[PDB]
């Protein structure tokens with residue numbers, strides 16, 4: 001992935017997000033409710049020291065679990081460590097595009113986050129333009145009804 | 154779906170095809186190996202009377218089953234009945250885009266078929282342009298290795 005947000009202000013991504021669309025390099029990363037990168041973002045809580053705490057949902061044992069993780073800051077403002085989290089682009093008000101990647105061929109998953117339970121075509125376009133550069137083999141998108149549901153059921 | 158192939162010559166789609174990409178209106182139509190519209194085209198055998206016999210693979214009971222169905226012709230050369238099959242576009246030599254649709258909100262699945270076990274970017278573009286008009290919520294694509302495998306494993 002060689003798109004990062006120039007001049008990311010991590011404090012300003014704080015609060016409510018909706019995982020509107022997801023994509024991944026391998027179908028097995030997103031295909032089942034329990035697929036490893038099938039993670040539904042709920043809220044981003046950046047620390048004063050500039051780390052990013054993430055609240056998300058995960059279908060684990062036939063159940064929508066609430067989960068909590070801290071992404072540790074790096075020397076690059078748009079890159080955090082868990083396995084790396086890269087912030088591609090955000091207007092802070094509406095949408096945020098991010099990817100997660102490991103080290104191996106690498107696993108890669110990217111989401112289009114939006115602030116509201118609405119299909120934002122403009123954001124989905126930017127998400128698709130960003131993905132053109134990337135070797136994705138599965139893409140998912142969610143309707144407004146599903147965005148208001150635990151684990152988007 | 155309001156894109157059909159003008160002047161389709163069904164005889165000329167005869168032979169070997171590869172399901173390179175699939176998309177559907179609902180994630181549950183494609184998400185699992187056993188999802189109902191997760192069908193891998195192998196060969197099209199059009200009848201003299203102008204019907205279309207389809208050989209495909211389907212993961213059913215933990216197994217890649219070989220399956221056989223006849224799509225019956227209609228008054229529209231680009232539309233067959235099984236549940237309707239619509240042929241969107243084909244250059245006969247390289248690619249064929251088709252959709253399958255039921256009657257209800259309708260289930261809708263579309264594929265980009267190619268003649269060879271190769272990622273055809275030009276065909277994938279035409280597939281994506283055709284899908285822009287359609288309410289798809291899952292997209293899959295397969296690599297050359299998977300195209301040579303039963304049920305694309």
Ligand SMILES: CCCCOc1ccc(OCCCN2CCOCC2)cc1
Pocket residue numbers: 013036039041044054056058067069082085087096098100
């Ligand atoms: C600003 C970008 C937001 C990043 O959001 C996330 C980044 C990584 C995530 O990783 C989830 C970790 C995968 N496992 C899921 C099952 O529980 C253990 C962790 C989740 C959200």
Ligand SMILES: CCCCOc1ccc(OCCCN2CCOCC2)cc1
Pocket residue numbers: 166189192194197207209211220222235238240249251253
């Ligand atoms: C030229 C267009 C090719 C159309 O190819 C197909 C059209 C419909 C298909 O329908 C599959 C029927 C769904 N079930 C799968 C499990 O066995 C029963 C049938 C398969 C290929």
